[PDB]
């Protein structure tokens, strides 16, 4: 796993990238926790191949173009219950073979 550090009440950015992203065949979600069998558990936000189209709250963004895979997640004004482990799921067409990786992010104070 990938560790990202960042700081308590500052936003941070959860790396992930589909380098060959296509518009008409794939989807992405994040979640809380380790990537499941399937989707993203306890999910905080759903692109469809261009756009996100579902969000836990205005909390989770993307700031990359997702139509080009830049699917890295911001979270803003961290506190602690945001700390621990994130999946970034890249779905592509067919079973068994979504990209599924996991980040955890650790915060502290300046
Ligand atoms: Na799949």
Redesign the pocket.
């Known amino acids: 796993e990938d560790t990202i550090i960042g700081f308590l009440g500052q936003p941070v950015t959860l790396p992930c990238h589909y380098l060959s992203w296509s518009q008409s065949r794939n989807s992405m979600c994040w979640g809380k926790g380790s990537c499941p069998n399937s989707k993203c558990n306890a999910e905080l936000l759903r692109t469809d191949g261009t756009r996100i189209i579902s969000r836990k709250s205005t909390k989770y963004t993307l700031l990359g173009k997702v139509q080009f895979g830049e699917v890295s997640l911001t979270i803003s004004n961290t506190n602690r219950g945001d700390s621990g482990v994130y999946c970034c799921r890249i779905?592509?067409?067919?079973?068994?073979?979504?990209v599924k990786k996991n980040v955890r992010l650790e915060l502290r104070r300046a």
């Open positions: 779905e592509v067409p067919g079973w068994f073979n979504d």
